[PDB]
């Protein structure tokens, strides 16, 4: 007996049909849109959305005045507004089902970086995040799949330690400036 936790999930489901042109092409398109490493990122997103839709489904079957349906539903809607996928007016349980994969890929950090004019391309944004140039509030974020919340979005900066941000030039600049 040890003091260790063996709890862990798989965070994606591999598709049933491995080769269908519609699917492959679609996922490729998605990838190209939001600058992702492989199919598995897309699949992760798909899995999460699927989970959400399951949750929403298993609530609608209960009575309108059933407490569980109310409370849990309200929580779920809150969670989906707090990330910035749904809208405050469309905060009813049925609207959850009409969500798309891309609407969750839009709230990824990379995409935010791209949109906010900190980067020039999606790949460029990704790289900027990876190299530790992008911070959120004050915390430096290395992970690009970091889902940006609605309230936290209004301050995504360039991190004081980076060359683009505060100052102190990088390595290449140091090397070139110390030639003669």
């Amino acid at each position: 007996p040890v003091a260790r936790s063996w709890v862990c999930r798989k965070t994606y489901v591999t598709p049933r049909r491995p080769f269908e042109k519609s699917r492959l092409d679609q996922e490729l398109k998605l990838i190209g849109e939001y600058g992702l490493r492989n199919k598995r990122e897309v699949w992760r997103v798909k899995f999460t959305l699927a989970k959400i839709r399951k949750a929403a489904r298993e609530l609608l079957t209960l009575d309108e005045k059933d407490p569980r349906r109310l409370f849990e539903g309200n929580a779920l809607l809150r969670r989906l507004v707090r990330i910035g996928v749904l809208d405050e007016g469309k905060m009813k349980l049925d609207y959850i089902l009409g969500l798309k994969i891309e609407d969750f890929l839009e709230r990824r950090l990379q995409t935010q970086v791209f949109k906010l004019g900190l980067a020039k391309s999606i790949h460029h944004a990704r790289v900027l995040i990876r190299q530790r140039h992008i911070r959120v509030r004050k915390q430096v974020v290395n992970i690009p799949s970091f889902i940006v919340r609605l309230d936290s979005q209004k301050h995504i900066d360039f991190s004081l330690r980076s060359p683009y941000g505060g100052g102190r030039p990088g390595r290449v600049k140091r090397k070139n400036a110390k030639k003669g």
């Binding site: 007996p1 040890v2 003091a3 936790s5």
Partner: protein
């Protein structure tokens, strides 16, 4: 097993202790005492997890051996000594007194008391027998056996005991129209007036209890604990007034709190 067990694992430990899942392999096995190990706080958990005074078991020990902690007006040096319901914990160096009373949710709340109130505790009688030359004995839920009590006192009644003497003072009889708390089961920690008790021979007697907010619920008689004559309690009551909040209303409360303090 060949004999009695001396160990308890953290996973098998009772939930209302609010222990972790990763700090160690073993929970602190409560020493045999006045309370059943399922429904009690060991002194260690209360001292280091609730109050945070100590950080480790060693630190806890270093307090218990310096003889600062008094449970029911008596110095206990054992770190695993079980303090249960209605139990008075006194630290004199800080000048702080706590009584173990169940929270609304079913856990042991850190409930601070006045030094005036800390002089007495309440006891549910478990059994009354007459033994040796016509001497009747009460036996309370805290294993405290009191010789020569009031002949009016019957089973399932609550008595007030002054801790300095160890003698009974005055009692509340179990009757419809008395304020109660639950000591075990689903409704644990909930407070209300007794509505109606129904008897079942050869089984547990189901007792109905009405809330302050009109929420009627039921329990077993072994789990009920009388407190108040009519409506007003004989002891202080936790910050949550014993009325169990539903989830939605709790959420609402939380939201309100968030709003108010920014």
């Amino acid at each position: 097993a060949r004999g009695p067990k001396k160990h308890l694992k953290r996973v098998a430990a009772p939930k209302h202790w609010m222990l972790d899942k990763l700090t160690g392999v073993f929970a602190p096995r409560p020493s045999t005492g006045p309370h059943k190990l399922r429904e009690c706080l060991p002194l260690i958990i209360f001292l280091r997890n609730r109050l945070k005074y100590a950080l480790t078991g060693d630190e806890v020990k270093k307090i218990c051996m310096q003889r600062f902690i008094k449970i029911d007006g008596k110095v206990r040096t054992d770190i695993t000594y079980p303090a249960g319901f209605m139990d008075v914990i006194s630290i004199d160096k800080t000048g702080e007194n706590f009584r173990l009373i169940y929270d609304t949710k079913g856990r042991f709340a850190v409930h601070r008391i006045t030094p005036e109130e800390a002089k007495y505790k309440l006891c549910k009688v478990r059994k009354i027998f007459v033994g040796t030359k016509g001497i009747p004995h009460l036996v309370t839920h805290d294993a405290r056996t009191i010789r020569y009590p009031d002949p009016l006192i019957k089973v399932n009644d609550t008595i007030q005991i002054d801790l300095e003497t160890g003698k009974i003072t005055d009692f509340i009889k179990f009757d419809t129209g008395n304020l109660c708390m639950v000591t075990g089961g689903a409704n644990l920690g909930r407070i209300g007036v007794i509505t109606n008790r129904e008897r079942h021979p050869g089984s547990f007697d189901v007792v109905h209890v009405k809330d302050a907010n009109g929420n009627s619920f039921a329990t077993r008689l072994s789990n009920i604990f009388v407190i108040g004559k009519g409506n007003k309690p004989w002891i202080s009551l936790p910050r949550g007034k014993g009325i169990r909040l539903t989830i939605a209303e709790e959420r609402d409360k939380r939201l309100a709190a968030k709003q108010s303090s920014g």
